[PDB]
Amino acid sequence: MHCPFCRHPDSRVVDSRTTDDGTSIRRRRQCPDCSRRFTTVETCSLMVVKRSGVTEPFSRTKVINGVRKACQGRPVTEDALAQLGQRVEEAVRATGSAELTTHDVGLAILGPLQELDLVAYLRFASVYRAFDSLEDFEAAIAELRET
Amino acid sequence: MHCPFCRHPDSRVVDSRTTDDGTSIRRRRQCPDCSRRFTTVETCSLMVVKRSGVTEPFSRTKVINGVRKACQGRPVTEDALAQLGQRVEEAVRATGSAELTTHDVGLAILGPLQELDLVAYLRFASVYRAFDSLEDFEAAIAELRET
Amino acid sequence: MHCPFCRHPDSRVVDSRTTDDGTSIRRRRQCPDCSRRFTTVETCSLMVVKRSGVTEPFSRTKVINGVRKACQGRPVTEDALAQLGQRVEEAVRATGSAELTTHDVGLAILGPLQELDLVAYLRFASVYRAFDSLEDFEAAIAELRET
Amino acid sequence: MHCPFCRHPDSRVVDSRTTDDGTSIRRRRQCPDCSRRFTTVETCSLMVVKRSGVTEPFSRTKVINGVRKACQGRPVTEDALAQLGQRVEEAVRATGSAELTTHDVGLAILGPLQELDLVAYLRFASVYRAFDSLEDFEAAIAELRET
Amino acid sequence: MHCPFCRHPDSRVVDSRTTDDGTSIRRRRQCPDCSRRFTTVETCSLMVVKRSGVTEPFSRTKVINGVRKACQGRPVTEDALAQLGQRVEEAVRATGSAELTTHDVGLAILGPLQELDLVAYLRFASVYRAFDSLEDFEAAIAELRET
Amino acid sequence: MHCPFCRHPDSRVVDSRTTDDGTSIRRRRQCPDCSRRFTTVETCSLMVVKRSGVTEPFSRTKVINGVRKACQGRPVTEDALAQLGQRVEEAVRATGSAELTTHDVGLAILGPLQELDLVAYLRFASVYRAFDSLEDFEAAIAELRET
Amino acid sequence: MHCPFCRHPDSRVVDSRTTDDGTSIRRRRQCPDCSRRFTTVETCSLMVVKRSGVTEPFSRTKVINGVRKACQGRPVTEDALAQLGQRVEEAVRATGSAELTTHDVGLAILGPLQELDLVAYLRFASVYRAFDSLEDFEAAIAELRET
Amino acid sequence: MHCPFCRHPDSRVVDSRTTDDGTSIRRRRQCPDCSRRFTTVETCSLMVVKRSGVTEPFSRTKVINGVRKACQGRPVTEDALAQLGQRVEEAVRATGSAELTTHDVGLAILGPLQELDLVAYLRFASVYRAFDSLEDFEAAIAELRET
Numbered sequence A, B, C, D, E, F, G, H: 001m002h003c004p005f006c007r008h009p010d011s012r013v014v015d016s017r018t019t020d021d022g023t024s025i026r027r028r029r030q031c032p033d034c035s036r037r038f039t040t041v042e043t044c045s046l047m048v049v050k051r052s053g054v055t056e057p058f059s060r061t062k063v064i065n066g067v068r069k070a071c072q073g074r075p076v077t078e079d080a081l082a083q084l085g086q087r088v089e090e091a092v093r094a095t096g097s098a099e100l101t102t103h104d105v106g107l108a109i110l111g112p113l114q115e116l117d118l119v120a121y122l123r124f125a126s127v128y129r130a131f132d133s134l135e136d137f138e139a140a141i142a143e144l145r146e147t
Ligand SMILES: Nc1ncnc2c1ncn2[C@@H]1O[C@H](COP(=O)(O)OP(=O)(O)OP(=O)(O)O)[C@@H](O)[C@H]1O
Pocket: A048, A050, A051, A052, A056, A057, A058, A059, A060, A062, A063, A064, A065, A066, A067, A102, A103, A105, A106, A109, A127, A128
């Protein structure tokens, strides 16, 4: 890997160790140009198994865009949207699995989303859960009232 | 019409092409004085007053995009929502005001969207109107039960 | 032109008259389907002769987008941006010419822009006037201070 | 590393492709237990803390877009600003913090942009910093005269 | 169905979403043996044999693009040609062959396009069939007069 | 699934059986509108695990585009390209696995490709196998000569 | 203008003369870096006044694309299409006017087009002249037969 | 220069903007006779004669796209190939012919591409030259060994 301090095309791994739980590998490497050691973390690519079976790369941008579509004309700032996206990403990586279904990401969005805007939660749950009729919205309203 | 460049009282229509869905006919006109083409568009002016007080031409695609956002995840085909939009344009041009607030446009879209989809109506009403709390969604639900 | 009340493919002009100053033609027409008269205004297409010589259609959307690029992180709402765009469009159509250069539109933006945000004016004048060095910004600051 | 799906302590690197400009090496790894490919990306983590408090990977294109917006209408070639961005990434990875606020990123870009272009520096400083009134532009101008 | 990865005779349908215009239902299925999602699509197979002898799924957009190219400059609205395409798909699925040459598809489109537009029919027939000389256009014209 | 003959929104499965090897499920269904039975095949979505780990849907269009990039200025017709794409798709589905790596698809392209154009094979193998230097091309030339 | 031989940012015009008919200006310039003189031609930008009044830059690519749309499945090579585009461009620049209407470009395409493919001429005239019904095609066939 | 619309011997340059990478300066000029803006572009004319015998302006992006296609899967960064293209334009403008066949352009690109990448040279030489059989690739390989 190209040295952050010397831009060398090639570098050698002088240390490679497994991190706790093995969710990452710590690889320190010595460059041959400026001889400055640099450490790197090798982590699994978080994949989202879309509902068509496509495993796209995980992107908090899509999560934030969906929540923003739910949060239209609401007292929800871009800072709050970014914080919710970060919380969703942190939860789904703390789950540990490399591939999460879009259903899991939707659930990870929903439980925090109640705190940012309960009404935005309703618009997000309606599109995400594919609420068939007002019975589904009334059921969703019930659950929001039940704790 | 007066040439826009030299103000000659007469100007002949070299060519005239209509818009098939647009109530606009685009005409290329020659001015006999300076011999300069100029393009004119003939259209009944539906001009909506936005919430900012500015005036914009009544555009189909704005209504289309609003309905599509409301209908995401509901079965409305691109053809059905295009029809909703055609129906709304026909209704608002019909009212014959020629200068209507976008509040009137929103009211025009909602009555057809109740027929097209109720989850979309709640999602369109939720974004269009404020819907600050779940109480607004319950009041709107009550309103849709009434009918 | 298709009737706003009857959707007929073809209609006949039963009255055509020239408006004051000839900036528009008033054409009333009778439809053959529902026999409801409708009046229309035939106006020149406002063209913007871009600095490459291309005469694009006038669009206040481009004006508002440019001003918004100038108005980044400022206390300038979308309502204010739309109002400035409307003012620019009104000024350039009150000029009367069908083709205005981008320089004319830039000037029509600049004089109102001082009222919405003087600092945004500086960022808009710097890109628009192609301010070569800080001497140009100091000269622009002088003019803003000189009335 | 532990397979993300069954947690097997050893997992062989089927393939490994580096990113030429990216300090990222993408590796496909097989798990001997469940025989399932999984993708890992090895990268020193430059993670900027946004103004919202969220954490994002240090992206070249954000710096590139910021500089390009500042330079619009100034002669900076796409190559020169790409270099500015490379220089900024080299400087911030160098500082060796591995977790820097976007304020640090903004300061990193400004010193090179003063060399690249002064109209751009004022336009970048104007947008980056608040610049509420012309007084901020005069203070910054004074600062650039000093140097 | 047999899991594609371990061939387990039974596999439960975790989820099933239909295509609204597509005669395709997309199902996510779990295999109890290896616990791996897999996506299946359920569709009557209209499979056209191209002029090259290859087999392709019967796609609406191919017919739509062919008709639109034929109709360029003729008044057919995007809705009318979409209908022509729907009508053609209904006719060819109806014939019940399930494996038809694109010659059959071309014949299916031409009879409806004669109703939709005659300039388009000559332009579609001209491109579809060879039409080497003006004599082919006169023969086709004679054929359209006959009817 | 919407009836091919009656367009009904909903239909019921009146027969569902597993095909030989379980690569598909045969589902015959009776519509409620025109009461015409229609049979459908439910098959796994062929997924291509890209070299980044993304499992895109299998598309012979990408295969044909890559081969066409290899087959530049060659005596290889579009019919031959489509036939090669069909052969590759048939081979990869006869493999039976739902997910094939891009390496497997590349191999399935390479062995037939020798028959369509050996020189195009060289250009496809060089990009696909990432031939480092002329030693790799000489080795590839050797294998083409060795049967 | 940047020297072709020294890449200098600025150069001075050491000779500027008007060419015959004034369709171009011959400007020879001496660079200050490598002191190598280079001559340049300053010509008017050929503008095409589109049928909407927009004056786009002239592009033979659009002409060739339109002719290619007419020349579908014909014995007309890409070399012939490029030659026809060059002939059209040469004719329209030999006309001398800076702005030509799309009608003039269409006429300049039509008369040569008869030589490349008379049948393609018919498909190009039908879209371009907006042939209303088979009477227009029969009239076009007559003119092609009349010399 | 003579006005293109009325042929007035003198026409003043209202404005003049250069192209930074382009050897083109775009000037808006007023004609005192008819008072009509017109746009002129001043450029040394590199005009390549294609294999079809037609003449096209020497475009950077054609060389860039040719090199990028040759380099796909080889490490050449978008910056390196942009440089190759700049170097080729500098070499061909330098030769001072002002009218060169695209064969000369191809020869100009190949000598730099040998330095940039040998797999790309074989892939560029393979597509550029015919390379009917593996014997052409062996002859070219021999040629690259020689050097
Ligand atoms: N690749 C991805 N990475 C991260 N989040 C994603 C990704 N794709 C979708 N999401 C988010 O996960 C949530 C799940 O959305 P949802 O399941 O409705 O989408 P989907 O599976 O793409 O649906 P559809 O295919 O029907 O459009 C949404 O908030 C969506 O924005």
